[PDB]
Write a protein that binds this ligand. Structure first.
Ligand SMILES: [Zn+2]
Length: 1287
């Protein structure tokens, strides 16, 4: 257990627990400091840390010490005895809180017992030397006013009060002759500058601060955790493992890049959480090896130490026993010490991955920042840590008796205001970047708001080095983790070996290096005429001395005029926001504009499914203009084309090493040492794949995800500025009114802010999900594949290497050289899938990843779409697409393949995607329109099969072909085995749903089956168990290849490939999404058009057509003629028959050219009677349920309705449409729908039933029924002449 001593600052010096100490950096000169022993080996000196600092620097100036800290200055802190005493009691309380739990008690016990080795690198192996500044510190015994008597003592930690900046706590180690004992295995006296009351503040982006943008946001820190973070640094230093290695260094070559000090792995390790993942596995192992090498030197010293010359009183045995336990060395029955790999690994991981800020915060239920790389906010001052009403040893601020325990409410600035006080900005210093244009106008930007983008030099290239494979050789992995619960329950972790007495001989060698610090300018001026994120955010603010503003969509005007504020919301929102109204209409306007704000913010949930994008925040580009000028043009379109990459401010240059070669050493006449060497070489290969992925993850997190974090913070700021500006306008407009008027205005400013704030929160959630999605997208599509390429190349070089190795050892291997020959082929066959959870256990990151992999659209590895008269792959994997001259393309995403040699498309797939999952698993989807057979060429039509899409490599692959009315899917494995599955549609149907009409195809493949779906419905299935490996990433050739007629062609649309098996549910959804349109379609499935001749088809009377009756102004219904030749293979009803109709637009007199017919449009349904254009009318006053339509010349009669409204009552995909007659466009009076009705006729000669073109009210209720009745006589389709259908 740990005992915390009690004392008052004014207690008498006793030269034991209360002394006058001579601090290490005083060099044995100057004055002494009253120090108090809080626990064994730990001292508290309640005075400012002045070593290396100029006296005047304790005052706030135009300079700063640290470029990334909101620095608070106060030279009076600790300037009285009472203040010193409060510091003392507060430190006592914090140590008590720390030991209130086993984990913290153990951190303290480890520190107290982790006594520095007696010496350093300069000391002979056979000696213990206490006469060095990192081991002994002196205390003055003599009377005041004279240093006539001093004594030495051993110490572990000395905690001082703060230096110039109160909130910049720091742990410092002692260097002597350019070296640090605390970094070379020995350990040494550690020092700290600490301030308990002025704590850091942080806000979580992925979350909310009480969800109040009008209230204070963020959470303040628990000083006990802040102290424990430093104590972890102390721990590292005491055990001599606070080593230096390759640091993460920020790129600072661009003006938008954040400048900060190099960051050591020891810092990211100390913080924990996701940060250790920014340290590559390569560097993790480098650090591990350095520490182990340091411990080897110490264990050698314990075997050789014989005396202590500096202190004759030192019992050599007592210390050897203590250092043995400290470093967990093992000792044989003779006293020989050695390193135990298991105990070392456990100790090392406990110290680096067990005791971390993140782990301690979780255990003490204290909230803290999510990462070292997060924006820092202004610190605050805790009112009184010694008041149990606000802070307790047991619960800190989160006191359950005050219900401040749940959701860390006690640390919430918006909730626990009684616990802290804000700091006067006049005492805060912050490093800013002044961005000026070449004119002059400048903008100040806090350094913390810039993008942190690690430079390429931050990452190790150890993966390029060669590796020697021996029978000995084994894998090397360092789990950046440690079971916290076993640490807490460890029975041998905490020492039970005697702590030596602290008194020793006086220190006489005061040699030591004292750091020297100095402030630097708080403002750096740069020049740039760029208008990126910082300028765009700035254009959304206004000066404090201005109160009357107006919004504008002009960024330029916003920068120019102080009373103009930029808004990225709609034109209507902006106009309404600047509207001035009468008092009586103000409450109405307020409700209106606030509602508009919410609607605009809500557009962050926009979907773009037709482009295969589930979520898109359309206004991000207008809001920040971040990345590649995202504010210009249409953002959704630009994102559809380039994806996540367009949002990044900078495209990082990734380090992706050419993996080094393997040197396999032979052992002639040794069957085992050879087989082992091969086994080891194979496992080592996996280490290379894992380490490579780790390198990528480290770079992604420190160069890409950091940028997306900045964008998220940026959108939060943008949305808040928008709300603040609106709030400003509302206040101004309201204060223009008199008191008499205000009294009668019904406004509730708090409900207004509650609604704006809610709208913002909703938007932020959408934005966070969108950006997180973009980040993972970049990692998976723009980073992982580039590493896979190098890794696959490595595999190839290693493959021949191993096979040739087996070759040179064929004798010594005998009958097995072939067995292992294939061992190499199959092992290097299955490639390592990337799994982020292997490199991190951070919940936020893991969930992001899992979410990404749970979205079927992220499985799209090829998506050919039309863009500026060309077809390109928009899957994000960058396939090369060559569209040759004979291919016809249009903006409807349809492309035509003809019989010409140059009507071809060549696609080169990305070779670095997991497609070969070693069991077949992928899908292909597309729409196709196949022309009708030529009546006089039916034999060749049913006989000649021709390929349309072929993808082969090494005579293995897949292919799509057609033979007349059948479409076929074929697979061919590496052996030549073939399997096929097909869909054949009937060519003897009176009316076909497939011939020359657009339909949706989807083929899926898994280990057992190959299935073909048509329009979402399963049609065929073939068992493909016998099929082995099928190479599917070969080149894809779209071209009609076979014995085809010159007139043969095929139309295709939306070709895509998925690297997984789509479910029936996925396919049905894709069918519906890709079928959707605002326009109606024609019989063939193309867009319905105005001013285009069409024959009419009735889905309820398929074989019937309309013809103007010879003796009456009505349309009689006749039976379609049919195919008349003798072929036994075909039958159909003529389609080009009956009156030739034409749809005319009602609105706008923009003449009669052509255009697209949309749902709900008002139209005129006309037709040609010889050289004249007639029209379809409905007699206004019929009283029956239905009546015959009136067909006559164009004219306007008060007795006839002439306006039709084209409709679509079916919710599912269909090419049918309905035609409605309403009294007029405005009324809700429905006259009825156009259809067909049967009438009985009994004349003097003939008796019979006849159908006529009619309108009926009966259809009105029928179209409402579910499921939609496709057979209704009110369902029509328009058939235009088409080269794909001849009769
Ligand atoms: Zn730290």
């Amino acid at each position: 257990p740990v005992t915390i001593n009690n004392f008052n600052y004014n207690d008498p010096i006793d030269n034991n627990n209360i002394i006058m100490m001579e601090p290490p950096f005083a060099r044995g000169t100057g004055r002494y400091y009253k120090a108090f022993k809080i626990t064994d080996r730990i001292w508290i000196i309640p005075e400012r840390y002045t070593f290396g600092y100029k006296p005047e620097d304790f005052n706030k100036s135009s300079g700063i010490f640290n470029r990334d800290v909101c620095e608070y200055y106060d030279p009076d802190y600790l300037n009285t005895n009472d203040k010193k005493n409060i510091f003392l009691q507060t430190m006592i309380k914090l140590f008590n809180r720390i030991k209130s739990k086993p984990l913290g008690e153990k951190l303290l016990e480890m520190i107290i017992n982790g006594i520095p080795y007696l010496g350093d690198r300069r000391v002979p192996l056979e000696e213990f030397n206490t006469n060095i500044a990192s081991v002994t510190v002196n205390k003055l015994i003599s009377n005041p006013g004279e240093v006539e008597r001093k004594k030495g003592i051993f110490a572990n930690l000395i905690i001082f009060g703060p230096g110039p900046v109160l909130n910049e706590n720091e742990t410092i180690d002692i260097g002597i002759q350019n070296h640090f004992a605390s970094r070379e295995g020995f350990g040494g006296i550690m020092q700290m500058k600490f301030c308990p009351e002025y704590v850091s503040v942080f806000n979580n982006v992925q979350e909310n601060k009480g969800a109040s943008i009008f209230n204070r946001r963020g959470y303040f820190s628990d000083p006990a955790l802040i102290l424990m973070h430093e104590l972890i640094h102390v721990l590292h230093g005491l055990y001599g493992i606070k080593v230096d290695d390759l640091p993460i260094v920020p790129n600072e070559k661009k003006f938008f890049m954040q400048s900060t000090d190099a960051i050591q792995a020891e810092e990211l390790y100390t913080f924990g959480g996701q940060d250790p993942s920014i340290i590559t596995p390569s560097t993790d192992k480098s650090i591990y090896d350095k520490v182990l090498q340091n411990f080897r030197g110490i264990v050698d010293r314990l075997n050789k130490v014989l005396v202590c010359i500096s202190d004759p009183n030192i019992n050599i045995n007592i210390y050897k026993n203590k250092f043995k336990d400290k470093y967990k060395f093992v000792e044989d029955s003779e006293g020989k010490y050695s390193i135990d790999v298991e105990s070392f690994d456990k100790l090392y991981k406990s110290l680096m991955f067990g005791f971390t800020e993140t782990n301690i915060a979780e255990n003490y239920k204290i909230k803290t920042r999510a990462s070292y790389f997060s924006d820092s906010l202004p610190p605050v001052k805790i009112k009184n840590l010694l008041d149990n009403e606000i802070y307790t040893i047991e619960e800190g601020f989160n006191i359950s008796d005050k219900d401040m325990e749940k959701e860390y409410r006690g640390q919430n600035k918006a909730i626990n205001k009684q616990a802290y006080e804000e700091i006067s900005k006049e005492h805060l210093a912050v490093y800013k970047i002044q961005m000026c244009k070449s004119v002059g106008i400048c903008i100040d930007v806090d350094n913390e708001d810039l993008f942190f983008i690690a430079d390429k030099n931050s990452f190790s290239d150890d993966l390029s080095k060669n590796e020697r494979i021996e029978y000995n050789t084994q894998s090397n992995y360092i789990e950046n983790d440690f079971p916290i619960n076993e640490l807490i329950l460890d029975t041998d972790l905490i020492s039970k070996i005697e702590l030596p007495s602290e008194n020793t001989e006086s220190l006489t060698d005061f040699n030591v290096d004292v750091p020297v610090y100095e402030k630097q300018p708080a403002i750096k001026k740069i020049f740039t005429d760029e208008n990126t994120i910082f300028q765009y955010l700035y254009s959304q603010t206004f000066p404090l001395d201005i109160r009357d503003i107006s919004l504008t969509s002009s960024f330029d005007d916003a920068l120019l005029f102080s009373n103009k504020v930029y808004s990225f919301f709609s034109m209507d929102y902006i106009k309404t926001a600047n509207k001035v109204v009468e008092a009586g209409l103000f409450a109405g306007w307020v409700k209106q504009i606030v509602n508009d704000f919410v609607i605009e913010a809500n557009k962050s949930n926009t979907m773009d499914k037709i482009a295969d994008i589930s979520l898109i925040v359309p206004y991000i580009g207008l809001a920040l203009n971040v990345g590649n000028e995202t504010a210009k043009g249409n953002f959704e379109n630009a994102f559809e084309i380039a994806g996540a990459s367009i949002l990044l401010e900078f495209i990082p240059e990734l380090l992706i090493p050419v993996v080094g070669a393997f040197l396999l050493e032979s052992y002639i006449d040794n069957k085992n040492k050879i087989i082992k060497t091969i086994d080891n070489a194979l496992t080592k290969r996996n280490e290379k794949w894992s380490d490579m992925y780790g390198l990528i993850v480290a770079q992604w997190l420190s160069t890409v995800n950091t940028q997306f974090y900045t964008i998220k913070e940026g959108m939060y700021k943008a949305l808040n500025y928008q709300a603040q500006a609106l709030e400003e306008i509302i206040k101004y407009r309201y204060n223009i009114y008199s008191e008499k008027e205000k009294s009668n205005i019904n406004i509730d400013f708090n409900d207004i802010n509650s609604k704006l704030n809610e709208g913002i929160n909703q938007a932020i959630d959408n934005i966070n999900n969108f950006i997180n999605g973009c980040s993972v997208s970049y990692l998976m599509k723009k980073m992982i594949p580039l590493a896979v390429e190098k890794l696959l190349d490595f595999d190839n070089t290693l493959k021949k290497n191993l096979l040739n190795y087996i070759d040179e050892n064929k004798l010594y291997l005998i009958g097995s050289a072939e067995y292992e020959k294939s061992k190499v082929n199959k092992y290097l066959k299955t490639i390592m899938p990337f799994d982020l959870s292997i490199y991190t256990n951070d919940t936020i990151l893991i969930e992001m990843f899992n979410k990404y992999n749970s979205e079927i659209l992220n499985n799209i590895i090829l998506n050919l779409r039309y863009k500026d008269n060309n077809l390109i792959d928009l899957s994000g994997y960058g396939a090369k697409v060559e569209v040759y001259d004979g291919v016809e393309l249009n903006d409807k995403n349809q492309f035509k393949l003809t019989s010409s040699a140059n009507s071809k498309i060549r696609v080169t797939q990305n070779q670095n995607i997991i497609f070969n999952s070693v069991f077949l698993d992928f899908s292909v989807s597309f729409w196709i329109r196949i022309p009708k057979y030529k009546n006089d060429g039916i034999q060749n039509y049913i006989h000649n099969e021709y390929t349309i899409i072929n993808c082969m490599k090494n005579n293995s692959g897949w292919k799509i072909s057609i033979r007349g009315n059948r479409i076929i899917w074929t697979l061919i494995d590496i052996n030549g085995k073939t399997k096929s599955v097909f869909f054949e549609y009937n060519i003897r149907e009176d009316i076909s749903e497939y011939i020359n009409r657009w339909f949706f195809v989807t083929i899926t493949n898994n280990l057992n089956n190959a299935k073909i779906y048509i329009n979402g419905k399963l049609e065929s299935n073939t068992d493909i168990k016998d099929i082995r490996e099928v190479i599917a990433n070969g080149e894809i050739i779209f071209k009609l290849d076979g014995d085809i007629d010159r007139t043969q062609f095929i139309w295709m649309k939306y070709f895509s490939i998925f690297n997984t098996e789509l479910s029936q549910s996925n396919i049905e959804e894709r069918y519906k999404i890709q079928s959707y349109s605002e326009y109606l379609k024609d019989f063939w499935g193309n867009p319905l058009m105005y001013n285009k001749e069409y024959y009419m088809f009735n889905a309820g009377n398929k074989n019937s057509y309309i013809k103007l009756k010879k003796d009456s102004p009505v349309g009689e219904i006749l039976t379609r003629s049919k195919y008349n030749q003798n072929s036994k293979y075909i039958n159909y009803r003529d389609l080009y028959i009956g009156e030739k109709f034409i749809i005319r637009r009602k609105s706008n007199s923009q003449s009669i050219n052509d255009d697209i017919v949309r749902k709900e449009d008002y139209i005129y349904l006309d037709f040609f009677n010889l050289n004249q254009e007639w029209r379809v009318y409905t007699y206004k006053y019929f009283k029956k349920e239905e009546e015959k339509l009136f067909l006559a010349p164009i004219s306007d009669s008060d007795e006839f309705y002439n306006t039709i409204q084209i409709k679509e009552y079916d919710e599912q995909p269909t090419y049918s449409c309905q035609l409605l007659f309403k009294k007029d466009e405005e009324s809700t009076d429905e006259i009825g729908l156009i259809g067909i009705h049967r009438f009985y006729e009994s004349g003097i000669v003939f008796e019979e039933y006849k159908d006529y073109f009619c309108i009926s009210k009966w259809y009105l209720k029928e179209v409402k029924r579910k499921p939609y009745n496709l057979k209704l006589g009110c369902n029509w389709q328009f058939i235009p002449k088409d080269e794909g259908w001849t009769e």
